[PDB]
Amino acid sequence: GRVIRNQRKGAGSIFTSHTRLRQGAAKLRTLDYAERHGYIRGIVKQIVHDSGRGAPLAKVVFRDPYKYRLREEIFIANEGVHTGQFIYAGKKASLNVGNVLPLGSVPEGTIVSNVEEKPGDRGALARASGNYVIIIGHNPDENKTRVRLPSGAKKVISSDARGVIGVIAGGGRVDKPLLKAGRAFHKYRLKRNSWPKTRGVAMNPVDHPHGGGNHQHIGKASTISRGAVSGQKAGLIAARRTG
């Protein structure tokens, strides 16, 4: 058989796109450890969209030269960031929606967006629109903390993370569905991946091993295990429960 489409992922022409055009998608910069009245903390400036996220963001000023020229500080968009209200940070910070501050300082059952989870990453969890995680691993969880990430599963965290308290801005992808597919293709150019899809049974067993038969059906198997090769591993990857 030929080269399967899932193998063409690591490199490719379809795997190139605009990188430096992207002004700064939503990490978090240096923002003051202290809050001895605060040093590096200020107001929100502009509201600008970075490509990659598919949601509005913002610019912020602190104590440092940030309106135009210095290209870095992008601030996490909560409803409704704009000119004339302050952000605060620090360790033992003031707990408000729109303030970036620790997980340790917030009590159990606070919703948080743009949150770290490994030992430092600037900003990982829930950067775009709609998204948020839920910190519920303090109190009888004594030393090592735990964000219970939104499905059901795990993640052990030491001290770990800062993040903005709240639910993030937007809400118009699940809350409001689209209309057509060329307007959906605006996703797959700010992200690098093939689009759309053709059926596995419709493709030849040559090009993808889910084909086979004059009366078309699945040739090999739909459930394939985790430890497998490239063309071998397709379909539902380890169907733990069917149905």
């Binding site: 409704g80 709240g166 057509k180």
Partner: protein, 72 residues
Amino acid sequence: TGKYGVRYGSSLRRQVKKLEIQQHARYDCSFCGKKTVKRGAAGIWTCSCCKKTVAGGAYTVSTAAAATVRST
């Protein structure tokens, strides 16, 4: 609904204007009030008049986030 057109059927195409309407019109601001405040940016309800920031969470002026921390 305008942009949507013939796409979708009965449950969706008709009913989304009834979501759009409460997202539309020009309201008062939290600190001023000429006719300005709608969905300015996406989820960010702006003010073209005296330029003034709101704080809620996701949608309009207050969501679940501000109902917890800016309350207790």
